[PDB]
Amino acid sequence: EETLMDSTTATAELGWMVHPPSGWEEVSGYDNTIRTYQVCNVFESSQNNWLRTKFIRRRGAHRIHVEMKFSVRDCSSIPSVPGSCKETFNLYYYEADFDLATKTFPNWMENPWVKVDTIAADESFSQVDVMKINTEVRSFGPVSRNGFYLAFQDYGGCMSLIAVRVFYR
């Protein structure tokens, strides 16, 4: 059973809190028709780009599973990339009983946010739309409060997050 949009369920404007506006950005991947996000700020020093989902009502459930799809342009594919170029992104989670999230609240550090795992492209792609896609699933334990937030963190590469889908057994 699904808790956050199968994918298309985004019904116009995903409305996702970007931390530095200069980070991620919504790109209309109308194809089905879908909202995606992407960063590719290589050639720009010190990057810490966050993206925070909306509050996901835990609906009972004790061990949620995050399924995500995403394209990641290799740092070696890029003409003159700096040494800074990274090609893995971080996933974090954060529990709360009611909303309370604020542009400043859940601090944008790995402290209040507990780190699920660092994600990299795994050699098993698929086409879409018509780019190659990676799927990769992580899951976090306990989670007892009423709901949660999710956040993806870039820090040096191009990569589109085609679709995120949160669900549980």
From Swiss-Prot:
What tissues contain this protein? Expressed in the epithelial dark cells of the inner ear. Expressed in the region of the proximal tubules of the kidney nephron. Expressed in myogenic progenitor cells.
- Summarize what gene deletion causes: Mice are long-lived and fertile. They display strain-specific circling behavior, are hyperactive and exhibit rapid head bobbing and twirled excessively when picked-up by the tail. This is probably due to abnormal vestibular function.
Where the record annotates domain Eph LBD, the positions are 1-169
Mind telling me how this protein is modified after translation?
Autophosphorylated; ligand binding stimulates autophosphorylation on tyrosine residues. Ligand binding induces cleavage by matrix metalloproteinases (MMPs) such as MMP7/MMP9, producing an EphB2/N-terminal fragment (NTF) and a C-terminal long fragment (EphB2-LF). EphB2-LF is further cleaved by MMPs, producing EphB2/CTF1 which is further cleaved by the PS1/gamma-secretase producing EphB2/CTF2.
Query: Any coiled-coil ranges, and where?
Result: none
Provide the function of this protein: Receptor tyrosine kinase which binds promiscuously transmembrane ephrin-B family ligands residing on adjacent cells, leading to contact-dependent bidirectional signaling into neighboring cells. The signaling pathway downstream of the receptor is referred to as forward signaling while the signaling pathway downstream of the ephrin ligand is referred to as reverse signaling. Functions in axon guidance during development. Involved in the guidance of commissural axons, that form a major interhemispheric connection between the 2 temporal lobes of the cerebral cortex.
State how it assembles.
Heterotetramer upon binding of the ligand. The heterotetramer is composed of an ephrin dimer and a receptor dimer. Interacts (via PDZ-binding motif) with GRIP1 and PICK1 (via PDZ domain). Interacts with ARHGEF15; mediates ARHGEF15 phosphorylation, ubiquitination and degradation by the proteasome. Interacts with AQP1; involved in endolymph production in the inner ear. Interacts with EFNA5. Interacts with SPSB1. Interacts with SPSB4. Interacts with SH2D3C.
Protein name, please?
Ephrin type-B receptor 2
Q: Which organism is it from?
A: Mus musculus
Indicate the span of the full protein covered.
Answer: 20 to 195 of 986
